[PDB]
Design a protein around this ligand. Structure first.
Ligand SMILES: *C(=O)N1C[C@H](NOS(=O)(=O)O)CC[C@H]1C#N
Ligand SMILES: [Cl-]
Length: 268
């Protein structure tokens, strides 16, 4: 007999009632292969969460371009956009590709993400990297900040929780990348600073977590994805995405953390 997915689903539905929108969740236990899935194939806006996959695409590029990571990108004023706290600090000097990548992942630095997008040939460059690892769902169309609009019905700049999770698993645990680059991706995720009230809030403090958040700032639209390493057990890969129908519906970190908990607890 298979899982009773109605029973697995029930507490997510309840959560989304008080939230006033939609929650998408996919979790995969890499030990057992068990999964939790709720609206896991619906599209949700990526917001800043594309920046993790961006860093991975940069790492993929570096495999073929020795020293790309230690190459400084020296930029002007036009690179800068709000929510770019690290790239703003280094305007007068520049930042290496590695530094920009760390800033994109760990501070969700907007300007740094746009600078790296330019290196890959724009949003379409990153989408093409995702297609190269078999993600047919992911689509990044625009740049920071336009990609944050999160307008109801817009398929631009979205993916599914499931596709996010499968791609995250390929890049962090599978061999999609070479082992040094894979470790570098994990290290960047592990050092994220913006995720303490989301998936990390659901995980025992002594378990290692790498994550990337997104917060569009409208339409209740926010997210997190992560790899979790329970001590002495196979890692878990999961993604939690939200949206809501009104522009002024608040997003909620508590809801994200609650959905992560339900997902993690439901794996077996
Ligand atoms: C991305 O979604 N961002 C970047 C920035 N940081 O928030 S995040 O949730 O940590 O990713 C502010 C909100 C939004 C923008 N712009
Ligand atoms: Cl400029």
């Amino acid at each position: 007999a298979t899982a009773l997915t109605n029973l697995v689903a029930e507490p997510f539905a309840k959560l989304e009632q008080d939230f006033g929108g939609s929650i998408g969740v996919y979790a995969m236990d890499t030990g057992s292969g068990a999964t939790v899935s709720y609206r896991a194939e619906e599209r949700f806006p990526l917001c800043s969460s594309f920046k993790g996959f961006l860093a991975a695409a940069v790492l993929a590029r570096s495999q073929q371009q020795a020293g790309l990571l230690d190459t400084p990108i020296r930029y002007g004023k036009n690179a800068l956009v709000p929510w770019s706290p690290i790239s703003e600090k280094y305007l007068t000097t520049g930042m290496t590709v590695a530094e920009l990548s760390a800033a994109a992942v760990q501070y969700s630095d907007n300007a740094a993400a746009n600078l790296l997008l330019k290196e890959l040939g724009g949003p379409a460059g990153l989408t093409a990297f995702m297609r190269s690892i078999g993600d047919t769902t992911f689509r990044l169309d625009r740049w920071e900040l336009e990609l944050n609009s999160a307008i109801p019905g817009d398929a631009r700049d979205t993916s599914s929780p499931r596709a996010v999770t499968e791609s995250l698993q390929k890049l962090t645990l599978g061999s999609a990348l070479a082992a040094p680059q894979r470790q570098q991706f994990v290290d960047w995720l592990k050092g994220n600073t913006t995720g303490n009230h989301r998936i990390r809030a659901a995980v025992p403090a002594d378990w290692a977590v790498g994550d990337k958040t997104g917060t569009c700032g409208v339409y209740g639209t926010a997210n997190d994805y992560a790899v979790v390493w329970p001590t002495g057990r196979a890692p878990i890969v999961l993604a939690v995405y939200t949206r809501a129908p009104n522009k002024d519906d608040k997003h909620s970190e508590a809801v994200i953390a609650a959905a992560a908990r339900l997902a993690l607890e439901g794996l077996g």
